[PDB]
Swiss-Prot record, chains C, D:
Record protein name field: Spike protein S2'
Function, as annotated: Subunit of the fusion protein that is processed upon entry into the host cell. Mediates fusion of the virion and cellular membranes by functioning as a class I viral fusion protein. Contains a viral fusion peptide that is unmasked after S2 cleavage. This cleavage can occur at the cell membrane by host TMPRSS2 or during endocytosis by host CSTL. In either case, this triggers an extensive and irreversible conformational change that leads to fusion of the viral envelope with the cellular cytoplasmic membrane, releasing viral genomic RNA into the host cell cytoplasm.
Coiled-coil regions, chain positions: 1-41
Full-protein positions shown: 953 to 1001 of 1273
Protein's organism: Severe acute respiratory syndrome coronavirus 2
C-alpha cells in the first residue's frame, strides 16, 4: 500500500538522474512528475514538508 | 517479484504493474498474511468476507 | 467583469477530476496502462470539452 | 406554458438512467462494489448536470 505524488518520496525506481538544465524548454521527470516546460530558479519559498 | 514463478497473481488496483518501476512511491507499507485460497477474493477493496 | 469571471471559471474547471483518478493527464499516463488510461482520459476529455 | 414545460422536463430527466444500472443512487450503491458504483454514479451525475 502506497500513496502517489503528494509528498517527498523515499522509495524510487531504478531510473537514473540527469543533470538539470535551466532556461530551456525541456521534458522533465522530477520524482515521477512529467511535464514539458522552461525551468527557472524561483524567488519564492517553500516549507520543508 | 515477477522473477518468482509460482503462477502468482499480481493485481494493482490504482496503478499498473509495468508502471511500478517508473514511479516513485512514498509512504510504502507491506502487509503479509496467510489466508485460505477461496478467501483471496475477499482481500480486495469493498469485498464482504 | 463577466468576461473575467467566465475565463476564471474555465481555469477553475481544469481542476475537476470528472471521475478520473487525477486531473493531471501525465499522472494518469504514468500510473496506468493504455487500456485503463484510455477510459480515464476519455472522462477528462469529455468534461473539458 | 414554456416555463412550465421546461421545469417538467427537468423533473422527468431525474428518472432517466443515462446508461447507469438504475436511476436511484441508493440502488447503485447497494448492488455494486464501490469502484464500479462510483463509475455508475458518475454517469448519473454527469447526465443530471
Amino acid at each position: 500500500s502506497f500513496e502517489l505524488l503528494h509528498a517527498p518520496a523515499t522509495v524510487c525506481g531504478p531510473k537514473k538522474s540527469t543533470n538539470l538544465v535551466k532556461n530551456k524548454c525541456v521534458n522533465f521527470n522530477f520524482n515521477g512528475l512529467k511535464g514539458t516546460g522552461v525551468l527557472t530558479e524561483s524567488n519564492k519559498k517553500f516549507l520543508p514538508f | 517479484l515477477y522473477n518468482l514463478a509460482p503462477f502468482f497473481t499480481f493485481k494493482c488496483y490504482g496503478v499498473s504493474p509495468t508502471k511500478l518501476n517508473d514511479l516513485c512511491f512514498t509512504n510504502v507499507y507491506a502487509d503479509s498474511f496467510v489466508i485460505r485460497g477461496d478467501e483471496v477474493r475477499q482481500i480486495a477493496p469493498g469485498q464482504t468476507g | 467583469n463577466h468576461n473575467a469571471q467566465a475565463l476564471n471559471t474555465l481555469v477553475k474547471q481544469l481542476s475537476s477530476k470528472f471521475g478520473a483518478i487525477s486531473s493531471v493527464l501525465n499522472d494518469i499516463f504514468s500510473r496506468l496502462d493504455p487500456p485503463e488510461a484510455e477510459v480515464q482520459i476519455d472522462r477528462l476529455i469529455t468534461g473539458r470539452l
